[PDB]
Design a protein around this ligand. Structure first.
Ligand SMILES: COC(=O)CC(=O)NCCCNCc1ccc(-c2ccccc2)c(Cl)c1
Ligand SMILES: COC(=O)CC(=O)NCCCNCc1ccc(-c2ccccc2)c(Cl)c1
Ligand SMILES: COC(=O)CC(=O)NCCCNCc1ccc(-c2ccccc2)c(Cl)c1
Length: 328
């Protein structure tokens, strides 16, 4: 009969009950200001189809972040703009400040609030158990907010989380893969970055939801508390599911596929094998034991589940005992 349908356990109908102006990004009117108010300072990084710069707004002498987009697909640029406008001012969401075009090259560019990203590789051995709980809670505030606004981020990973450690300030960035959640909709599974892809994407289950972001968040938590980056080290999209199965086991994978009547791709035939369900305590070592606790492992166990419906929502996660020590 094909795959079994699924819907989000929370914020299911938030877009259904809003006028088209909110979620119909193709009809949104963009007003492209003048790029001359900004002067580019330095390159911060380069993505698939974008280049990010530190810049200065010459009218007020304030630093900003400018993301120059390679306009390969206009519909995708309109989607990112509409989502950023909808989420503007949400907790720990990057703030869109302007939208401009090069008067001469006419290449689109998004102008954001400035974020002072602390370099981390240096201070990952510096983070304490408390710091991980604190920043995980700040990410959860951003996710509960965007999910409540009917948006899935679909690219949660450390590169998309900027932290200014000195000011204990976090921003969830790069909403280029974000999408509006509409119950029953079949989405493209070619989203997120390999190590953070949820099992739903790897088995080509298209009717996914906000819970995809909770899987990605679980991958980040596991890599931080265990000092293992990435946690699930796949070499391709099929091998990525095998890396997950080497931890969660193959029995629960078949229960997940059976529950949703998913047809497993033949490419899994010779590589999946048989794997027992591992105890999370097996990843604890002398290098990471100061970051691990029974609460952390119980919280991680509740995010890293094959069944997208069984994972904690962002609001349920914020109520977990792991966060009893953080201000809420
Ligand atoms: N394009 C995807 C899409 C856009 C809008 C809707 C919708 C929203 C509200 C009421 C009826 C339909 C749906 Cl289901 C999907
Ligand atoms: N100096 C002024 C200036 C000129 C052009 C741009 C620009 C805008 C969009 C795409 C590429 C470049 C910017 Cl940010 C500033
Ligand atoms: C393209 O240039 C840009 O503007 C992007 C850009 O500058 N990105 C730099 C990525 C910064 N990442 C740092 C970081 C550190 C710790 C965590 C963390 C993970 C789990 C639990 C607690 C904290 C995360 Cl999510 C991120």
């Amino acid at each position: 009969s094909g795959p079994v349908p699924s819907r989000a356990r929370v914020y299911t109908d938030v877009n259904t009950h809003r006028p088209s102006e909110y979620w119909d990004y193709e009809s949104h009117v963009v007003e492209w200001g003048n790029q001359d108010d900004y002067q580019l300072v330095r390159k911060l990084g380069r993505g698939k189809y974008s280049e990010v710069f530190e810049a200065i707004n010459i009218t007020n002498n304030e630093k900003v972040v400018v993301k120059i987009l390679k306009p390969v697909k206009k519909k995708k640029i309109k989607r990112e703009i509409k989502i950023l406008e909808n989420l503007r001012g949400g907790p720990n969401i990057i703030t869109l400040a302007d939208i401009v075009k090069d008067p001469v090259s006419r290449t689109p560019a998004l102008v954001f609030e400035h974020v002072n990203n602390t370099d981390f590789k240096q201070l990952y051995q510096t983070l304490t158990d408390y710091d991980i709980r604190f920043y995980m809670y700040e990410i959860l505030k951003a996710l509960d907010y965007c999910h409540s606004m009917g948006i899935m981020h679909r690219d949660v990973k450390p590169h998309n989380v900027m932290i200014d450690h000195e000011h204990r300030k976090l921003r969830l960035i790069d909403w280029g893969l974000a999408e509006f959640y509409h119950p029953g909709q079949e989405y493209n599974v070619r989203v997120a970055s390999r190590y953070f892809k949820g099992p739903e994407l790897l088995v080509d289950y298209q009717m996914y939801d906000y819970s995809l972001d909770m899987w990605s968040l679980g991958c980040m938590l596991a890599s931080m508390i265990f000092r293992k980056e990435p946690f699930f080290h796949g070499h391709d999209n099929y091998d990525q599911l095998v890396r997950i199965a080497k931890v969660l086991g193959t029995e629960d994978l078949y229960d997940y596929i059976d529950k949703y009547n998913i047809e497993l791709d033949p490419r899994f035939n010779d590589i999946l094998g048989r794997h027992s369900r591992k105890r999370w305590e097996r990843f604890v070592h002398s290098e990471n034991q100061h970051l691990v606790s029974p609460e952390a492992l119980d919280f991680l166990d509740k995010l890293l589940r094959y069944d997208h419906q069984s994972r904690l929502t962002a609001r349920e996660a914020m109520e977990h005992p792991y966060f009893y020590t953080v201000v809420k």
